[PDB]
Structure 1
Amino acid sequence: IRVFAIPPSFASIFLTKSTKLTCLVTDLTTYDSVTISWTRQNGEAVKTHTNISESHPNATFSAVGEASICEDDWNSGERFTCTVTHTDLPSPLKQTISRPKGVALHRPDVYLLPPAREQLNLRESATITCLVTGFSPADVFVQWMQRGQPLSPEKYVTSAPMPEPQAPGRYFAHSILTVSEEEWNTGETYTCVVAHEALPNRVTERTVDKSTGK
């Protein structure tokens, strides 16, 4: 029985085009008359509450906290919390949700890697990785395109940003794309963009063909 705190991961904020700090409950079971407030330690209204999601009764609740907030105001670094005024939990919960300060914005040195000879001698799949490397902010979102048309995570997956061991301050992350080898062997561009807050343009892209990778 605890209100889960969900800081806005850059993946989610670039999926929904807006920063999203929420307080969704995870282990909270069926308790009717859900009264959960969105106020700080001083008391302030909600920044344009929108996108109410239904509470699926499958042994959990969905305490709505979704809101659209300006990215500049998000990067200004304001302290805010989701106090709990529910009947089950009357005591407030301290959920300090903001980007980790004391951080140097280091852009992701992005290296897109075509597959090696080991898929050329098997001809079953070409798992092409857009390995992002060396960026101090942890969260990052990697998605791909065929030409300019984006590609869904049903063919690819962005691995979690576990830290880089050579530079403890920086992190890295990872992402693949698993499709047929023939579709990659047509000389068609798989252009992986990399959304990150430390980039100057906030989105940088690399492309590989059958000839771009040597």
Structure 2
Amino acid sequence: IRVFAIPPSFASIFLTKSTKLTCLVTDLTTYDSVTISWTRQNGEAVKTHTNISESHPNATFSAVGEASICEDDWNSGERFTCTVTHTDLPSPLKQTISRPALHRPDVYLLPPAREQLNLRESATITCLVTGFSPADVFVQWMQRGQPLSPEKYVTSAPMPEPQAPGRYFAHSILTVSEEEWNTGETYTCVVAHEALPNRVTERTVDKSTGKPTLYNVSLVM
């Protein structure tokens, strides 16, 4: 009879610019005619839930409920609760959810290794973000102000640092070719975190990053 809900993380809010609600009910016998209605703490109705789900094949029933609530009370601490009406229990079970240090992340960009440029077949550029709380952040890539497709980069799950008790680190690699890296392709990444007052921190790099921008010495035969 355990009911688990997935609160909308900051990564899913900044991406589509439209936060929603969704609660799931498991460990229940499969049945029919189950209505899921969301109820706020005050006691007013919400948007009409549509797009019902089905039952899991493993002799279990799953129910879903959608809503459309703007950012007016989520940041304050409003307790969202969905109501599930099942025939097995006489009294519907209600489960409430809420919003659980704010360290500013520091984005560091690392140039590709010299051993990889000799292959002249691929290039890896990372977007390192360390010291951020909480986890589940969103980092994307933009090229000359135009974001790239999500299929070209994968964001790893944040993990706690070994020495830092309350700071997390994230990684975001980008698989590109070596030929393009020599003709620009800055590949500026932006991290979306709620701890930053501006919530945006982006840095740009190019081929001439290690140069102190004072001298340019090469070798000519």
User: TM-score category by the smaller chain?
Assistant: 0.7 to 0.9
Give TM-score scaled by structure 1 length. Answer: 0.79
Q: 1:26 to 1:155 in 2, by over 3 A?
A: farther
Q: 1:62 to 1:128 in 2, by over 3 A?
A: farther
In 2, the alpha carbon distance for the partners of 1:175 and 1:156 equals 7
How many residue pairs are counted as aligned between the two chains?
Answer: 211
Structure 2: tracts of 5 or more residues without a match: 212-221
Cα RMSD, aligned residues only: 3.3
- In the TM superposition, residue 183 of structure 1 has moved relative to its aligned partner by 2.0
In 2, the alpha carbon distance for the partners of 1:152 and 1:58 equals 36
- In the TM superposition, residue 21 of structure 1 has moved relative to its aligned partner by 3.3
Q: Deviations over 1:160-205 (max 9, x none)?
A: 1211222222222221111222222212220101111111111221
Q: 1:85 to 1:200 in 2, by over 3 A?
A: same
Q: 1:65 to 1:184 in 2, by over 3 A?
A: farther
Q: Deviations over 1:139-177 (max 9, x none)?
A: 210001011011122010111121122222222222111
Give TM-score scaled by structure 2 length. Answer: 0.77
1:1-214 to 2 correspondences below 5 Å = 3-24=3-24, 31-40=31-40, 43-46=43-46, 63-87=63-87, 92-93=92-93, 95-100=95-100, 104-212=101-209
In 2, the alpha carbon distance for the partners of 1:81 and 1:160 equals 28
In 2, the alpha carbon distance for the partners of 1:88 and 1:30 equals 10
Q: Deviations over 1:97-127 (max 9, x none)?
A: 3321xxx322221112232223212233222
Q: 1:68 to 1:40 in 2, by over 3 A?
A: closer
Aligned identity (percent) is 100
- In the TM superposition, residue 80 of structure 1 has moved relative to its aligned partner by 1.9
- In the TM superposition, residue 6 of structure 1 has moved relative to its aligned partner by 0.9
Q: Deviations over 1:71-112 (max 9, x none)?
A: 352211112222322346666555443321xxx322221112
Q: 1:26 to 1:204 in 2, by over 3 A?
A: farther
Q: Please tell me whether the aligned partners of residues 3 and 28 of structure 1 are also in contact (alpha carbons under 8 angstroms).
A: no
In 2, the alpha carbon distance for the partners of 1:111 and 1:169 equals 19
- In the TM superposition, residue 52 of structure 1 has moved relative to its aligned partner by 7.9
Which structure has the larger Rg? 2
SS at match of 1:118: helix
In 1, the alpha carbon distance for the partners of 2:176 and 2:128 equals 17
What's 2:218 paired with? none
Q: Deviations over 1:6-26 (max 9, x none)?
A: 121222112221333321457
In 1, the alpha carbon distance for the partners of 2:33 and 2:65 equals 16
In 2, the alpha carbon distance for the partners of 1:127 and 1:26 equals 42
Deviates more, 1:10-19 or 1:67-76: 67-76
Deviates more, 1:179-188 or 1:91-100: 91-100
Structure 1: tracts of 5 or more residues without a match: none
Q: Please tell me whether the aligned partners of residues 82 and 93 of structure 1 are also in contact (alpha carbons under 8 angstroms).
A: no
Higher strand fraction: Structure 1 or Structure 2? 2
Q: 1:164 to 1:29 in 2, by over 3 A?
A: farther
